[PDB]
Amino acid sequence: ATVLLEVPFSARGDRIPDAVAELRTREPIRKVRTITGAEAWLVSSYALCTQVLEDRRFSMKETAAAGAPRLNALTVPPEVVNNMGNIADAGLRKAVMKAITPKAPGLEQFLRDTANSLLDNLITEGAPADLRNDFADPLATALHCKVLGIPQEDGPKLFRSLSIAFMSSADPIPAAKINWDRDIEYMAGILENPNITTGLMGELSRLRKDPAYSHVSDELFATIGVTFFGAGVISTGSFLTTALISLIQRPQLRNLLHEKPELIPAGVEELLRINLSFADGLPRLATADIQVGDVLVRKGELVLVLLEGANFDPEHFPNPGSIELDRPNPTSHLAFGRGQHFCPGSALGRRHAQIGIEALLKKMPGVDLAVPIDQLVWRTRFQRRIPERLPVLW
Ligand code: HEM
Ligand SMILES: COc1ccc(-c2n[nH]c(N)c2-c2cccc(-c3cccc(N)c3)c2)cc1
Helix, strand or coil: CCCCCECCCCCCCCCCCHHHHHHHHHCCEEEEECCCCCEEEEECCHHHHHHHHCCCCEECHHHHCCCCCCCCCCCCCHHHHCHHHHHHHCCCHHHHHHHCCCCCCCHHHHHHHHHHHHHHHHHHHCCCEECHHHHHHHHHHHHHHHHHCCCHHHHHHHHCCHHHHCECCCCCCHHHHHHHHHHHHHHHHHHCCCCCCCHHHHHHHHHHCCHHHCCCCHHHHHHHHHHHHHHHHHHHHHHHHHHHHHHHCCHHHHHHHHHCHHHHHHHHHHHHHCCCCECCCEEEEECCCEEECCEEECCCCEEEECHHHHHCCCCCCCCCCCCCCCCCCCCCCCCCCCHHHCCCCHHHHHHHHHHHHHHHHHHCCCCEECCCHHHCCECCCECECCECCCEEEC
16 A cells, blocks of 8 residues: 655755656646645646636635645744735735836846855855855845845845745744744834835835825734745745756856857746746645636645646647747746736846856856766755755866
């Protein structure tokens, strides 16, 4: 006898398990067991993944309900699950969106300067360099301090919460609450700090004292700051890191993008499509009985939308494992989700990776792994797939 198929399949972010394609072909929605012991429906075809993400009866916010089957334990207060919904309800969506676009004056120049400085320091210190801890993550952290309008020197301490905050754990995590409460107190202080007048926290600080927002809670304002810094940093840092591995693994692509930098946006779009940075499917709770493929999903059941299921589906992306810069449907991947909860940071995330890669290829055109790829150490029971260190030479 055998037990029910368990998720996740593998913490390795450098290759997709052969199992995904077999599953997609034979059972593109099927029952699995999560690390909590709960049952869930795993959805792995492009067609069924988009169906679920485009049907609001598959609810994000209801995943936080007491007694629901769980993918993993909450690491935040249940209100945080619906942070974007609460932002919308408070009348803050347009202002938040505007604050996190990469189009702010001087932001792209800032990103370029920061990337080049990080890379110069690596070159000075001499190979091997760790491109995650000493390039991609610090670039993400610096970017988000700038976008939030908070001091650069505060970045590292906020960053160190994240190795716990974005755990994917069977059980509640005591350190997560300690760090969450501390970070909320920090952001509350930021809102009271008269020197904070730019970026997202600058704008929130202004709106907080505007009569049109006098009944928006200080808890929500602080929560937006902690949530957007943390989710933005973990998402951009982890994506850029695993995109760099994909690029290093492809010397011909690396050379083409070095030679023709104008192709980098199209390269980044394919790197997004093939990216394995999400460690778990996106969870949703059914709020009605809903037919998905051959399965009638029942009210109250957990559904997991497997992003690499959709994104490597050959029916939608022929030769899915290949980076092709001339696809006719290049942004139709699900790396930023789809529907009601489409990532509001998508433009910023694109620009972070484009500028990071452009700088790296200019400074280190000969970049290569300094260790056999199997020697990368993949973080386990985490919401992202990332190597603990990314040693390179050039
Ligand atoms: C390469 C970078 C990024 C990737 C791959 C990414 C990916 C995603 C995905 C897949 C979702 C949908 C989750 C779901 O439907 O369950 C999402 C939502 C979200 N993202 Fe991102 N993200 C990135 C960058 C950012 C940045 C830079 C920010 C903010 C500074 C951000 C903030 C958010 C927020 C607040 C949501 C929730 C939206 C909602 O519930 O309506 N993300 N992201
Ligand atoms: C800052 O630390 C956090 C840890 C977990 C969450 C969290 N727990 N459960 C849910 N639902 C969320 C959440 C809330 C808002 C946005 C995102 C999210 C999810 C995927 C990608 C990106 N960029 C953001 C996730 C939020 C913040």
